[PDB]
Amino acid sequence: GFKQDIATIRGDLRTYAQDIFLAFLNKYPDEKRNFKNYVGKSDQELKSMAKFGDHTEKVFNLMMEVADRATDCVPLASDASTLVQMKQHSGLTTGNFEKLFVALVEYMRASGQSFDSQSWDRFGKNLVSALSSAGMK
Amino acid sequence: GFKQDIATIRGDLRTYAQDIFLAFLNKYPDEKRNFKNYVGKSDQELKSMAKFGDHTEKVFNLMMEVADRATDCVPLASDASTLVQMKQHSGLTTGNFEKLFVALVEYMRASGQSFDSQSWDRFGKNLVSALSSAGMK
Numbered sequence: 001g002f003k004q005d006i007a008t009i010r011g012d013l014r015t016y017a018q019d020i021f022l023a024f025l026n027k028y029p030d031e032k033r034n035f036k037n038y039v040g041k042s043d044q045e046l047k048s049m050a051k052f053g054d055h056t057e058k059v060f061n062l063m064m065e066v067a068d069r070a071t072d073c074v075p076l077a078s079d080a081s082t083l084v085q086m087k088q089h090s091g092l093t094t095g096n097f098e099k100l101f102v103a104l105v106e107y108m109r110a111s112g113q114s115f116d117s118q119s120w121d122r123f124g125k126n127l128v129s130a131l132s133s134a135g136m137k
Numbered sequence: 138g139f140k141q142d143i144a145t146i147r148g149d150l151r152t153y154a155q156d157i158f159l160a161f162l163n164k165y166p167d168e169k170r171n172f173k174n175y176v177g178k179s180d181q182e183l184k185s186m187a188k189f190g191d192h193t194e195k196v197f198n199l200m201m202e203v204a205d206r207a208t209d210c211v212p213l214a215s216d217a218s219t220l221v222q223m224k225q226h227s228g229l230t231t232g233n234f235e236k237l238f239v240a241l242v243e244y245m246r247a248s249g250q251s252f253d254s255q256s257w258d259r260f261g262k263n264l265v266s267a268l269s270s271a272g273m274k
């Protein structure tokens with residue numbers, strides 16, 4: 001289920017974070033508007049970039065904590081406020097987060113593994129609602 | 138406290154895992170008998186090896202899960218058995234883990250951060266006696 005998936009991702013976080021983030025960027029190429037240092041590079045080139053590895057790790061480290069702190073896939077208000085008020089998230093709207101989780105759930109559904117895809121869909125939709133409530137457009 | 142330290146470490150897991158694992162190897166150089174592939178390499182060389190970082194990341198993820206599951210810094214007997222029964226752990230005594238946590242606590246005390254060093258000291262002692270219970274010599 002959802003709690004076990006959190007442990008699965010944490011067990012190999014580097015690989016999942018990189019693979020899921022790449023699925024996001026390849027499914028929604030226009031999202032590189034936000035990460036212009038990743039333009040013009042293949043997956044293998046991104047995976048050898050220090051900055052890419054560090055960013056994906058810290059994103060998914062934090063995403064797994066937000067997931068771990070949720071109840072029934074509903075994230076804490078404090079966690080959403082953190083995400084809205086991060087300096088690095090200044091320009092973003094909820095549609096950006098929706099697309100990350102669409103790609104994440106698609107990655108799980110295409111995986112050989114028994115991820116609780118439906119739970120992560122709910123988590124994504126509940127996080128977006130939480131971010132709206134904390135002020136994200 | 139202990140719970141917040143878990144979140145602090147998870148937030149930047151690979152960086153804390155490498156620094157702590159390095160402080161352990163450097164405090165107890167004999168312990169490299171167990172990691173032959175790290176012999177003859179400075180900290181910076183080890184930090185450049187993807188395999189070194191992958192190992193430290195998986196170790197400290199599991200350590201943070203055993204920590205998160207503990208009650209009042211008392212690990213589950215089941216986790217202690219898992220760590221004894223791992224094949225990679227075949228032939229270790231509790232002195233090996235005792236030394237890891239001494240280096241971990243010393244690292245925290247020297248940090249400029251308000252880690253709850255005493256809790257980690259107790260978690261390490263309680264893990265060591267739990268590995269003893271679960272059959273480690």
Ligand code: HEM
Nearest residue numbers: 031034035055058059060062063083088089092096097100
């Ligand atoms: C959904 C869960 C998300 C989490 C947990 C998360 C977390 C993070 C973290 C930890 C950082 C690093 C901040 C630092 O270095 O202190 C970061 C940076 C950043 N995030 Fe996110 N983020 C999420 C979603 C998104 C989305 C959907 C976008 C855009 C589509 C985005 C855009 C950015 C940008 C542009 C930066 C910093 C610029 C850079 O990479 O140098 N984030 N985020």
Ligand code: HEM
Nearest residue numbers: 168171172191192195196197199200225226229233234237
């Ligand atoms: C709470 C403490 C510890 C935890 C959570 C832990 C966890 C792990 C994990 C998850 C792995 C597998 C990593 C992978 O799959 O890549 C591993 C491997 C290993 N561990 Fe530990 N460990 C701990 C303490 C120790 C100590 C104190 C020693 C020896 C001083 C040790 C010796 C080893 C060795 C030799 C390997 C195999 C390394 C290799 O294949 O290159 N472990 N440990």
